[PDB]
Design a protein around this ligand. Structure first.
Ligand code: TPP
Ligand code: TPP
Ligand code: CA
Ligand code: CA
Lengths: 806, 415
């Protein structure tokens, strides 16, 4: 679970010392200098004679506009941390404020600790400035390469979901969450403000949202800075916050008055938070209004007010670089030089180029430093789950009665397994869902926990399984669920969320950003320890969406996740749960895995159970497997056709087609694919099937009929250099469907058992089986006409049991 | 264009120093003395033994009533200017307060600079007093002959139009505009209050209107001083001003409390103006309420309260001269002598007749002085226009077709 770090929720009981404020003001100057040096300078960091245009980088990359505001806030937060011993993680929402994050880590000493070539002297400072956003250096954003980041904030709008995920079951953790005022215009951010209705001030930590109201986004004003101050305050009060406003930099107040004013307001806010935390030790049934800070400052604060007659400080014109080419004109170089000198670096750095002791003597030390807090490197906190014994949940009836027995709902099995994970791993495992946990049949967890709800309660007739604390969280937002879980994992804990398949697409871009985090971490950031995997139960899938119908039918999550499978990163798992015993085997592998995004595509409809758990574990280790108990070919040369399937509904239709083929005497081989990346090119993926293993399973030369759960294009693209790939005939979802019966869903997508039987006969000999082929096609129209007439599927479809069942 | 002068729109961020206030109080005493000397005295400016009726001018010309109020305001404005380095031009609306304007220029040193015969000693002081409103001397009003004037204010009612014209495209310029409360009865003044709807606080300067509410015009009370204080405040708030009122001289408050009270109110007003100017660097789309000062003081303030049983201080009777002939009666000469002595000139002037250093050590210096500000001598700022080539606009068709061609509208060409 989360470590208790420091002395949390302590009031100061004194004014902020004038010396500490003198520290904060020097911090802001030197962090601003170091932010500018990283953007503009390739050499001569301390502007020794001669400082000329040759010291300027040839291409200016990075963002000034948000940066001096972030440096201000970070300076004051560091003072706060050292004075109070508070366990603190910052969410840097305007993540293009990269130079502030790297400057912080350089000043707190964690940068040189982590990156020993970047020393705390003039040659290390030169390397520090050149490397920023440079070929072979470090990124422009607050990337996972930076000590202290758990959030790159490249794609905007997840700051608050990540902040609130971080503090769940983390009652000593304080998260100051800096939100762009442009970022506050996004969808995901806008709903993220309501997360305070889903956290509990006793059992969870505290988020302080900080609205970086600098007035501007890239080229536009921001909505929230142009509405009235009364509207802006009512808005935050309507969302359960008590808003405080700070305004600075729009007049000629000296910088030391600003710092005193801010430290006074910070400590007032903090006294309000400590009151909330102290009250919650007794009463955590009544939701407080949490503080939030509206930080109103000019964009690009302390850049030159006018460059070439255009307003730059307090404008969108300061967003990227205020000064656009200091290398090309003497005039613009002089502006850069005077700007760099306005921070007076001669007082900041000593003769050797180290930042002076009195600049940083207010800073926190040890694990309380922003770049050294374990919650910001949450792999160091994370332990293996205590997992229950997987055979306790095994469907034993396959071994009793035969492969293909029963009408179980496979996700109920996962639900019972996850219930006992939650029971064995209190405060360490969570379930998230967008109001779909019961619907996706995971509600056995309510026997051991509750849905965390901190809005109002009204009646025990409606409010079952809800409590102000609990390990299940539901809000109708895929962005919230994915974002909560992502930060729960990045801070060292574990979990799962579930979703209807077609709505996974809502967070495709969040999955992309989590995968780029993971890809960069496993390629090049070894000091960042492995975090628990992002586990996604994909249920209510396309084949059993014949009640919501056509516009809820999109299995396309698989195509998205296949674009993050390169260079042996192995950060993606794509798993088709064939039945409940395969779902168990998959779930245990995903629950033991680290540094991944695991998609688990499982049906929740009643379906057969095909495998025992020991067979499921064997198929899962390779990824695909022949089912010799289902083949009537007895090796690869007497097979006429290979019937392969990936997914539970393709497996059902292929197994029903193999029974009709067997009745015709045909010699075939049956294959199941549980793990989709096992089919990936053996050159590209060293966990995938070797080409010899692939040709034993599939064959060297026989026609393979392949029923696939998602778009056939996924498979055709993956097997492009596999042996015998020209003989594959992939059937997937093909954008057909309506609100209809289950048979009609498989029929219109050409994956029903009769079409698959017919396709196998056309592949074997379309001419000797011509009579029986015309017979199967006529039945397809007749079983559809039955559904229209009677209101339910034809009994040859619905009553079918595999012949292996005794 | 207009020069940026000084350090405009700067807050003080400290109380006004007690020493500067002692400066302002000595300024007011000596400017009042020098105003009276200019009206009454033809000789013996420092009343050396013997000071007799022969030293009194044969004909008394000029205006006392507005003057000590103007000297008060001007003293405090000079302190303000030296403390803040503000570019400042004064519009003296009651322009018949001539002696205040000449006294200011004599005290700030610009008079002797401009008029080398009027030296800063006892013989220059004698010439200074005799010349005022005298045959072959200088005028009764705040005439163009005075350093610091851009507005004679003889004919009343243009103070605010001139104040607001001055600050247009002049974003560093502060104009304290002193308005007579009788002058506020005129047509042109009454509409001049709305000019704040035609200026922009970023691109233009700032006018502070100062209503010299002394209660009286020549022989009548003033409308604005006889309506209720609630009506008077609503009026200014209706015209886009935030009014501040100062009241002094109608009780026995010592003069040093008055100065402290005033300097506190002045700096509060000025902090409001600096806020307006600082806001306008970001938002100049929303019109602020500008401050204005209602300055309520007795007319003729510090003249003898009663002359011959008639109320003189705080009356229209102090408008021209409180004392009507100090040359004709021993009784009236003694009133003038005691009046002149009430300012205690022995502490103001040294043995040679120069105003003492500690009287004027609070004063502004250089181009920030009222009589040396280039905006008050604007010919020094002015350059030739860049004019476009006149043949580009010539109607060429006379030469083509003949004299008398066309149906042009001549003013479109000028346009
Ligand atoms: C989802 C998304 N769309 C567009 C962008 C491009 N972008 C980067 S910075 C930025 C402006 C950000 O504004 P704010 O949130 O206002 O940031 P800050 O001012 O503090 O720089 C935008 C639009 C983005 N980062 N994310
Ligand atoms: C248009 C116009 N009409 C008449 C006069 C005559 N006049 C001179 S001073 C004066 C009284 C001015 O009153 P106020 O404005 O009240 O001046 P202050 O009291 O400050 O002396 C008048 C009526 C004038 N100057 N201008
Ligand atoms: Ca912004
Ligand atoms: Ca008057």
């Amino acid at each position: 679970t989360s470590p208790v770090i420091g002395t949390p929720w302590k009031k100061l009981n004194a004014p902020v010392s004038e010396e500490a404020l003198e520290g904060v003001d020097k911090y802001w100057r030197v962090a601003n200098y170091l932010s500018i040096g990283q953007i503009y300078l390739r050499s001569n960091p301390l502007m020794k004679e001669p400082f000329t245009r040759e010291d300027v980088k040839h291409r200016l990359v990075g963002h000034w506009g948000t940066t001096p505001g972030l440096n201000f806030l970070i300076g004051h937060i560091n003072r706060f941390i050292a004075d109070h011993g508070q366990n603190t993680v910052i969410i840097m929402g305007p993540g293009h404020g990269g130079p502030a994050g790297t400057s912080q880590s350089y000043l707190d000493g964690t940068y040189t600790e982590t990156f020993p070539k970047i020393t705390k002297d003039e040659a290390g400072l030169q390397k520090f400035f050149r490397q920023f956003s440079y070929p072979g250096g470090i990124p422009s954003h607050f990337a996972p390469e930076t000590p202290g980041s758990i959030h790159e904030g490249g794609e905007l709008g997840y700051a608050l979901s990540h902040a609130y995920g971080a503090i769940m079951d983390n009652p000593s953790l304080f998260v100051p969450a800096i939100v762009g005022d442009g970022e506050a215009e996004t969808g995901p951010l806008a709903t993220g403000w309501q997360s305070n209705k889903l956290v509990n001030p006793r059992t969870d930590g505290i988020v302080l949202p900080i609205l970086h109201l600098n007035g501007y986004k890239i080229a536009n004003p921001t909505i929230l800075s142009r509405i009235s101050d009364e509207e802006l305050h009512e808005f935050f009060h309507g969302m359960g916050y008590e808003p405080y406003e700070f305004v600075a930099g729009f007049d000629d107040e000296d910088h030391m008055s600003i710092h005193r004013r801010f430290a006074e307001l910070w400590e007032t806010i903090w006294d309000e938070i400590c009151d909330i935390k102290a009250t919650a030790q007794t009463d955590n049934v009544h939701r407080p209004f949490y503080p939030m800070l509206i930080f109103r400052t000019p964009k690009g604060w302390t850049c030159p007010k006018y460059i070439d007659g255009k307003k730059t400080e307090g404008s969108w014109r300061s967003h990227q670089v205020p000064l656009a080419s200091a290398r090309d004109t003497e005039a613009h170089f002089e502006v850069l030089k005077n700007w760099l000198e306005s921070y007076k670096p001669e007082e900041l750095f000593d003769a050797n180029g180290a930042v002076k002791d009195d600049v940083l003597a207010f800073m926190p030390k040890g694990e309380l430093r922003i770049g050294a807090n374990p919650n910001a490197n949450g792999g160091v906190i994370r332990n293996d789950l205590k997992l229950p014994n997987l055979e306790d949940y095994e469907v034993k009836e396959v071994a009793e009665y035969g492969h293909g027995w029963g009408q179980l709902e496979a996700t109920r099995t996962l639900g019972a397994y996850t219930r006992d994970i939650i029971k064995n791993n209190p405060r360490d495992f969570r379930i998230f869902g967008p109001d779909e946990t019961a619907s996706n049949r995971l509600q056995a967890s309510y026997e051991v926990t509750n849905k965390q709800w901190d809005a109002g309660y009204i009646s025990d007739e409606v409010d079952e399984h809800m409590h102000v604390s609990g390990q299940v969280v539901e809000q109708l937002s895929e962005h919230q669920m994915e974002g909560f879980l992502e930060a729960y994992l990045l801070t060292g804990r574990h979990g799962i969320w579930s979703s209807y398949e077609s709505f996974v697409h809502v967070i495709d871009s969040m999955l992309n950003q989590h995968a780029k985090w993971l890809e960069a971490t496993v390629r090049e950031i070894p000091w960042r320890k492995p975090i628990a995997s992002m586990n996604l139960l994909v249920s209510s899938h396309v084949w059993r969406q014949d009640h919501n119908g056509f516009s809820h039918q999109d299995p396309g999550v698989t195509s998205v996740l296949l674009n993050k499978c390169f260079h042996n990163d192995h950060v993606i798992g794509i798993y088709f749960a064939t039945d409940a015993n395969m779902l168990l085997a998959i779930a245990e592998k995903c629950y033991k895995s680290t540094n991944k995004i695991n998609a688990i595509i499982a049906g929740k409809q009643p379906a057969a159970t095909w495998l025992t758990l020991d067979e499921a574990r064997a198929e899962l280790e390779k990824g695909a497997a022949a089912w010799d108990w289902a083949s009537t070919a007895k090796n690869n040369d007497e097979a006429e056709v290979v019937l392969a399937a990936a997914g539970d509904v393709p497996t059902q239709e292929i197994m029903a087609a193999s029974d009709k083929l067997k009745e015709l005497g045909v010699k075939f081989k049956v294959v199941n694919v549980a793990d989709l990346l096992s089919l990936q090119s053996a050159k590209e993926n060293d966990e995938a099937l070797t080409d010899e293993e692939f040709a034993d399973i599939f064959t060297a030369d026989k026609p393979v009929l392949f029923a696939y759960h998602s778009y056939a294009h996924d498979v055709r693209g993956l097997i492009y250099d596999r042996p015998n790939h020209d003989n594959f005939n992939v059937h997937g979802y093909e954008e057909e469907g309506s609100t209809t019966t289950p048979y009609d869903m498989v029929r219109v997508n050409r994956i029903d058992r009769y079409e698959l039987t017919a396709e196998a006969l056309r592949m074997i000999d379309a001419d000797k089986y011509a009579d029986k082929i015309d017979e199967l096609e006529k039945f397809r129209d007749e079983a559809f006409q039955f559904a229209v007439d009677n209101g339910y599927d034809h009994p040859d479809y619905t009553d079918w049991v595999y012949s292996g069942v005794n």
